[PDB]
């Protein structure tokens, strides 16, 4: 093991679209659901893959309030998206928070979350940790 500085540990976010997973909003909405009784969690990562399709989603009840959470000041838009799908919806019979059925994470600007927020552009992805020093980093990055 060659680990000399703490900032040699990278946390990369790879999207599901690079895993040949169908990413149209038609068949990407069946990996998502509502559930009560689970707290949301966030985890910091460092860098990530440039995304192919991203999503911007706000859903509401028939009384007029959003079913997703209010985003904190930490949450920002995803940096690079080739295509952003704007979906406005309404879901009567559904209480709780939004969760992912595959166990994947909703990627934002250096924050991976288990829930979806309001008015923020995310993607679907998973993170991985590795140890890279500078001499090997300059060899692969280009």
């Amino acid at each position, epitope marked *: 093991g060659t680990l000399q500085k703490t900032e040699d540990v990278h946390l990369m976010g790879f999207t599901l679209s690079g895993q040949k997973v169908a990413d149209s*909003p*038609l068949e990407a*909405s*069946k990996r998502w659901a509502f559930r009560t009784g689970v707290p949301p969690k966030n985890v910091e990562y460092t860098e990530g893959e440039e995304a192919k399709t991203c999503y911007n989603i706000s859903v509401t009840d028939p009384s007029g309030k959003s079913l997703l959470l209010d985003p904190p000041s930490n949450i920002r838009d995803y940096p690079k998206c080739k295509t952003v799908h704007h979906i*406005q*919806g309404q879901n*009567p019979h559904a209480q709780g928070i939004a969760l992912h059925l595959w166990g994947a994470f909703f990627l934002y600007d250096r924050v991976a979350s288990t829930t979806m927020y309001r008015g923020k552009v995310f993607t679907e992805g998973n993170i991985a940790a590795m140890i890279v020093n500078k001499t090997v980093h300059r060899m692969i990055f280009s």
Partner: nanobody
């Protein structure tokens, strides 16, 4: 097919109303339905629209005009065969005659992302409308 509107009236600025749209001889579970408004001396403009499939997640896909976002909400109840619009925080620029409409041209396939149903040449079966007046 035959639609009617109800629930309009005169309110002050910042008030709220709820309009109902019912069908007598038509089951609304085959149509995508929308609310419009028209001012005297102005053209008939889009307000809101709601789709026809359910999708479990993102249940009914809706769309709103930019002047009425975060204030108006549209909804439907299939068993009661009714489409509601709840309007909150009214301005005197919202004073108009409101109309209910349906289409069968769209509402196929599934989830309609982005500005959809914003036109008026495909909507038919307009009701007589109701007058919403916001003034001090």
């Amino acid at each position: 097919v035959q639609l009617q509107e109800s629930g309009g009236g005169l309110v002050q600025a910042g008030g709220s109303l709820r309009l109902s749209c019912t069908a007598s001889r038509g089951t609304i579970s085959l149509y995508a339905m929308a609310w419009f408004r028209q001012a005297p001396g102005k053209e008939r403009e889009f307000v809101a629209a709601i789709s026809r499939f359910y999708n479990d997640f993102i249940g009914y896909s809706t769309n709103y005009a930019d002047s009425v976002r975060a204030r108006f909400t549209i909804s439907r109840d299939n068993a009661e065969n009714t489409v509601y619009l709840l309007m909150n925080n009214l301005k005197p620029e919202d004073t108009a005659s409101y109309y209910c409409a349906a289409s069968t041209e769209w509402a196929s396939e599934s989830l309609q992302y982005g500005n959809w149903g914003h036109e008026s040449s495909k909507y038919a079966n307009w009701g007589q409308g109701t007058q919403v007046t916001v003034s001090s």
